Design a protein around this ligand. Structure first.
Ligand SMILES: C=C(O[C@H]1C=CC=C(C(=O)O)[C@@H]1O)C(=O)O
Ligand SMILES: C=C(O[C@H]1C=CC=C(C(=O)O)[C@@H]1O)C(=O)O
Lengths: 205, 205
């Protein structure tokens, strides 16, 4: 199951990157990954890391808009058909039946694309890759939950599809600080660049 | 870079699985992943974990053959075009130029398929998924190196493509015992079943 997640502080220190990539507003898309009521409610939303996570994603979204970076959301649909949900059910059960809305502080606006999420990777069973390729966007800024699961899997697919992933270290959260930090170390070492919210904002500008 | 890998003992204790899946010879394919001279030579092949790794993979291959389970190998090609190698070069450099052969103790036979490996996941830029689907094989037994990189990424893709991954805990190796054990814990918790060589052999029979 997803645990009841004990409060923990968002990390400030981030791993060093092996790559020198920088976010370019002409190349990038901002993904807000699985910030649904369902997933967020495994935390106490009034306790760390959630207030600061939300603030950081809000800020990045506002800066993205100002810079002309498209924003895309992922969200799982309720009551997934067992044949379509497939092997996920063997790990997580039948899945959400409610609480599908994106949390209000991160409400999608009319021009923000909302993709249906079927697997850990946002690319699977979705038009994400075709859209990025059609529009010539080859950087994906990744925020949301959970760092070691769909954030990581989406970054791996992006990387393998020749899209530079930028995972925002204080713009994701996870089941624990340990899982969160290990995820960032894995990403920096193997499959993307990790940036702070402040650094990503500076690069976007 | 891939480190010069210090000797370490293959783990015997394996994590518990969340799933109750069992290998079925009518459903399964055995993947021997990146057991090329190039990758193996980052270890001392005469020191643990390599002699036991090789023995275990040899045994599984022989049992697979006896049980009618197809065997498939992956191998990276030498001197990859930078445009095709893409973002990998930013993490690992230009990649191998030599040492492309599968190590002799695991020599492919005439009926064993050899796929060209382009990304961490064996599915990317390959016919693997189409072949599995065409032939109705929906279990993938995974052996080889490195546990936390291509073994993990291949398992993630298989899982997301509705193929049950069985990662052989004492049939893979990695940059360190810690990386190896963490990989197995991740897999058992999130994206496949971990089996010992002995257990996989019993299930195959
Ligand atoms: C927020 C995520 O959803 C996954 C994690 C746990 C449970 C899940 C489920 O019930 O389907 C999702 O697959 C993520 O991909 O990180
Ligand atoms: C044995 C693997 O190759 C990868 C790991 C390190 C260096 C690699 C390279 O130079 O391309 C591979 O991407 C694996 O996928 O686990």
């Amino acid at each position: 199951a997803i645990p009841k997640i004990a409060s923990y502080p968002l990390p400030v220190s981030l791993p060093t990157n092996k790559v020198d990539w920088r976010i370019d507003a002409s190349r990038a898309v901002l993904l807000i990954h699985n910030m649904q009521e369902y997933f967020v409610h495994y935390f106490d939303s009034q306790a760390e890391p959630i207030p600061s996570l939300i603030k950081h994603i809000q800020q990045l979204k506002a800066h993205a808009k100002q810079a002309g970076i498209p924003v895309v959301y992922t969200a799982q649909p309720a009551n997934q058909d067992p044949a379509e949900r497939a092997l996920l059910s063997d790990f997580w059960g039948p899945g959400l039946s409610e609480e599908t809305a994106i949390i209000a502080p991160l409400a999608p606006e009319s021009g923000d694309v909302q993709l249906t999420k079927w697997r850990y990777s946002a690319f699977k069973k979705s038009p994400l890759l075709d859209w990025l390729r059609e529009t010539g966007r080859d950087q994906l800024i990744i925020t949301g939950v959970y760092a070691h699961i769909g954030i990581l899997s989406t970054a791996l697919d992006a990387f393998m599809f020749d899209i530079q992933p930028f995972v925002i270290g204080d713009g994701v959260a996870d089941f624990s600080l340990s899982d969160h930090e290990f995820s960032l170390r894995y990403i920096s070492g193997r499959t993307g660049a990790v940036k702070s919210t402040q650094q990503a904002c500076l690069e976007i500008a």
